[PDB]
Nucleic acid binder design. Structure first.
Ligand SMILES: [Mg+2]
Ligand SMILES: [Mg+2]
Ligand SMILES: [Mg+2]
Ligand SMILES: [Mg+2]
Ligand SMILES: [Mg+2]
Ligand SMILES: [Mg+2]
Ligand SMILES: [Mg+2]
Ligand SMILES: [Mg+2]
Ligand SMILES: [Mg+2]
Ligand SMILES: [Mg+2]
Ligand SMILES: [Mg+2]
Ligand SMILES: [Mg+2]
Ligand SMILES: [Mg+2]
Ligand SMILES: [Mg+2]
Ligand SMILES: [Mg+2]
Ligand SMILES: [Mg+2]
Ligand SMILES: [Mg+2]
Ligand SMILES: [Mg+2]
Ligand SMILES: [Mg+2]
Ligand SMILES: [Mg+2]
Ligand SMILES: [Mg+2]
Ligand SMILES: [Mg+2]
Ligand SMILES: [Mg+2]
Ligand SMILES: [Mg+2]
Ligand SMILES: [Mg+2]
Ligand SMILES: [Mg+2]
Ligand SMILES: [Mg+2]
Lengths: 62, 380, 132
RNA sequence: CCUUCGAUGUCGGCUCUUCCUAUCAUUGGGACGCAGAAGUCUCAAAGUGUCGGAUUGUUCACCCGCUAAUAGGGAACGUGAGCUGGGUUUAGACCGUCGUGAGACAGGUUAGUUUUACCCUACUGAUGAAUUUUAUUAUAUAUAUACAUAUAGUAUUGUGACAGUAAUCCAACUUGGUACGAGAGGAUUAGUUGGUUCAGACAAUUGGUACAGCAAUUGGUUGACAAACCAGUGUUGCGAAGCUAAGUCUGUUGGAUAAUGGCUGAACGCCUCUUAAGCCAGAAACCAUGCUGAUUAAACAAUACUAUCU
RNA sequence: CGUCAUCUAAUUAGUGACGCGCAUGAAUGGAUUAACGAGAUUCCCACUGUCCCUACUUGCUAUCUAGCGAAACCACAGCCA
RNA sequence: AUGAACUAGCCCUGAAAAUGGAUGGCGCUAAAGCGGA
């Protein structure tokens, strides 16, 4: 089964789940849950949240 | 004078006495037309509703915008444990309608069949069906000879097995299943071989077939005209409140007519819906009952954490395209079409590419429980 | 050219003001009608991202104003479902000025354009830079 | 000027149902000054539809649009214990014309309390006994029998008289740049893929909802930390389950006919669809099939078990 | 619903002009006018459940129960063509 | 042995409205209809 990344908290998205969003320039983003899309449209950064994969990578925790 | 502008009527008058139904179980009003060139066969089955999920399928419609693409569809799961055949009943035609000759029962019946005849079994001596099954076979054969000679319609009495489901109820459900097919003698020889056995569901239906569904809708109680009938909501300035109908009728038929929508009870209605297609018939003896040729993860049909408000499905089942009236646990009656469909949709055969089994509590993210432990590593 | 256009959610009713998205000289469009709309008593006509509309220009160069013109919707901000299984939405609402036959009056679209629209109108797909 | 002056609420709109046909569109036909296309006159026919807006208190009117078409009407000029109160039509006030004057004006203008249902029926849903002057489309062992049979209680499965009923319309492409036509132009029909209005459900996905829950924080108060609390839900972010649309699914085929076109065939040695006898094809209309109810039939059948007693 | 222009997509509404004015006009005061007004009217930006098209939710009633307990109205009474 | 032109009895066309309805009802055609005895 083919999956794709989450672009905010890079999980795997199985078919029938997602939510895409096109910026003013033609860059496509792909979030799976409502929470992630809401956080991304409030201009928050994944590097500033303790539970995300980006934070654990910048703190040598993975 | 005439109304200023035209609009179609709100309600439908063909479902008119919107009252609560007599019973939970959905009853068949008419059976399919009997063709006597076919071999004898059963025409109906009964199961319980579990939940929904979605699948992935490849389209095969030349001319469509979706001719060669992968799509997603919703589906409904019905738990379909086998029934048991327990009796025979024969009808003959009269100018007053169909008429029963007699009923013949099998030699032994189960305690969950007998519970349906009691309002409280726990305090009783349980003497139902304890004398009549002790008759000599000669009387039964004479009765069957009479049924062969004078009757024109046979039906078979069958019942469900609620102990194999997660239901709290223990009484079985009883229904009559008509038997279409050849001559009356062949019908009788057909039924008797089944009189104390199991009907599995794949004996009755086939993959890719088209089916009709009978059940009772979900209940909601007393509702207003705005919700019950969908009438135009009234302006904010109105003095006694705005959720009503402004005019009940002209002066002078000096009564209210039966076509005017009022408040009343909504839901718990009896319905019959046509043309629901079968996608897969599962089997309880099969380890990969929700895996495809393109996805070889070994899976069952039940999502991570159980079907919400139902339980775990661990018998054999049906997968239907679309939706079905009723709540979780509601009994669903299944019937073949009145006459067989020959359109392109009813003949096309379906190949599935993905069945989803992620949790329906919250927003599920894994297909199995092993993936979840593999992703996080060791916890505290 | 075929006209199939599997259904798309309508949210752009009569009275909306959207961007102009091209180089014809106008800056916005004011929707006054939708082609092929039927009858229903109190209901407003509304459009989706592949429909032709009638509109006027409220700010822009003086030869385009005070007129009834044709337009075609290219981007919309309301989420709509794709048959593959996800939902989509843009930033803003945009359209271009066209002929009654769908021939552009300008010669270049500015930003991205939706794939459903570009399949029904070939000149627009020719004149677009990115098709999303 | 017949009824109402010990009172029948007096314009228009909004909402909602039903009826008519003098038919606008949709169905099937006849005629043309009918090549095709586009139209015009006319027959059966009321099954299904008949919209969004700018100005005006408006009925009416007029213009901008889409459409398949934007037909005409009735029900105490349908509808105020349904609403609204812009106009008209009490008492305040301004202008013009008229009057010696108090005042007048079907001439303008501005501000000016809209009361009561718990009764009877009707209608919508919700419980519920009683029914021998009563009933029977058979029961018995090919033969007999209405000079007959029938108790009650609890319970399951069924019959179905009668009443209600549901789907509707459009586009693109192929047939075909073909038939027809000097050219210019340019069908019908059938097929495929989609859509509008309507109806019956449903929640796997997307969105809305918050006095399950978790977290943040302003003022104040328990000596501090910790834990909390008050400010009628102090204020914010996310927010499962459930409900829910703007989201998803489903929406048949037979009988007998109307208009019309025909067959055989006298009256009337010829002819004639019958304006005699006897026949055929045939419509979105009718009757069924299918669907909902069936204390709408004070209606009934088979079955299981049981009643110091058939 | 005077004619012309303007405002809109569309204007019996608003504004600026024209004047043989049914019946305008000088302390019955005429024509203007900054500041002021719970005074009458038209357009523009911001804003929004007024609307497309409705849904979900809290308190207090209504509801069932134990106590307590009125009135208006009433020729006689309450199915239809 | 055909062709016409007139005349008057029954029948028919002319003959379209709004709740479902009215020779008083059922119904009636070797009349239970119309003109006589
Ligand atoms: Mg009020
Ligand atoms: Mg869920
Ligand atoms: Mg585990
Ligand atoms: Mg309206
Ligand atoms: Mg009086
Ligand atoms: Mg009165
Ligand atoms: Mg009155
Ligand atoms: Mg026409
Ligand atoms: Mg005419
Ligand atoms: Mg009136
Ligand atoms: Mg009148
Ligand atoms: Mg009133
Ligand atoms: Mg009124
Ligand atoms: Mg009234
Ligand atoms: Mg007033
Ligand atoms: Mg006054
Ligand atoms: Mg959500
Ligand atoms: Mg939710
Ligand atoms: Mg205005
Ligand atoms: Mg004077
Ligand atoms: Mg003077
Ligand atoms: Mg004066
Ligand atoms: Mg109380
Ligand atoms: Mg008294
Ligand atoms: Mg002659
Ligand atoms: Mg008489
Ligand atoms: Mg008589």
């Amino acid at each position: 089964v083919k999956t794709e990344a989450c672009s905010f908290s890079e999980y795997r998205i199985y078919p029938g789940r997602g939510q895409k969003y096109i910026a003013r320039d033609g860059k496509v983003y792909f979030y799976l849950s409502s929470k992630f899309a809401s956080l991304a449209l409030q201009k928050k950064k994944a590097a500033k949240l303790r539970w995300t994969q980006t934070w654990r990578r910048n703190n040598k925790k993975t | 004078s005439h109304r200023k502008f035209e609009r179609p009527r709100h309600g439908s008058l063909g479902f008119l006495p919107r009252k609560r139904c007599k019973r939970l179980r959905g009853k068949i009003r008419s059976f399919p037309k009997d063709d006597k060139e076919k071999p004898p066969h059963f025409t109906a089955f009964m199961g319980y509703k579990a939940g929904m999920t979605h699948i992935v399928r490849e389209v095969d419609k030349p001319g469509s915008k979706l001719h060669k693409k992968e799509i997603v569809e919703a589906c409904t799961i019905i738990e379909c444990a086998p029934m048991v055949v327990v009796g025979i009943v024969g009808y003959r035609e009269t100018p007053k309608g169909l008429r029963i000759l007699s009923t013949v029962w099998a030699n032994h019946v189960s305690d969950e069949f007998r519970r349906r005849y009691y309002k409280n079994w726990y305090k009783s001596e349980k003497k139902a069906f304890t004398k009549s099954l002790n008759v000599p076979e000669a009387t039964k054969n004479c009765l069957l000879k009479r049924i062969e000679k004078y009757c024109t319609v046979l039906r078979a009495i069958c019942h469900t097995q609620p102990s194999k489901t997660p239901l709290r109820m223990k009484k079985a459900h009883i229904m009559e299943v008509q038997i279409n097919g050849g001559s009356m003698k062949e019908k009788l020889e057909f039924v008797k071989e089944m009189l104390e056995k199991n009907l599995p569901v794949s004996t009755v239906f086939n993959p890719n077939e088209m089916i009709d569904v009978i059940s009772v809708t979900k209940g909601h109680g007393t509702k207003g005209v705005v919700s019950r009938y969908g009438v135009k909501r009234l302006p904010r300035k109105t003095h006694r409140g705005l959720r009503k109908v402004a005019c009940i009728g002209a002066w002078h038929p000096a009564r209210v007519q039966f076509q005017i929508p009022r408040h009343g009870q909504k839901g718990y209605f009896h319905r019959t819906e046509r043309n629901k297609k079968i996608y897969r018939i599962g089997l309880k003896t099969d380890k990969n009952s929700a895996s495809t040729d393109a996805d070889i993860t070994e899976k069952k049909i039940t999502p991570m954490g159980g079907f919400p408000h139902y339980g775990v499905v661990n018998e054999d089942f049906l997968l239907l395209k679309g939706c079905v009236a009723g709540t979780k646990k509601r009994p669903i009656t299944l019937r073949k079409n009145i006459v067989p469909q020959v359109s392109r949709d009813a003949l096309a055969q379906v190949s599935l590419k993905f069945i989803d089994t992620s949790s329906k509590i919250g927003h599920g993210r894994f297909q199995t429980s092993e993936e979840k432990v593999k992703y996080y590593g060791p916890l505290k | 050219t075929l006209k199939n256009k599997m259904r798309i959610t309508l949210s752009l009713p009569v009275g909306a003001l959207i961007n102009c998205c091209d180089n014809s000289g106008g800056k916005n469009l004011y929707i006054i009608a939708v082609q092929g709309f039927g009858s229903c008593l109190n209901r407003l006509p509304a459009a989706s991202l592949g429909d032709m509309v009638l509109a006027t220009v409220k700010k822009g160069k003086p030869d385009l104003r005070k007129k009834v013109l044709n337009a075609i919707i290219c981007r919309q901000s309301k989420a709509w479902r794709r048959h593959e299984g996800y939902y989509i939405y843009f930033e803003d609402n945009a359209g271009v000025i066209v002929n009654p036959k769908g021939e552009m009056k300008g010669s270049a679209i500015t930003g991205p354009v939706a794939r459903e629209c570009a399949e029904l109108w070939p000149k627009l797909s020719s004149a677009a830079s990115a098709i999303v």
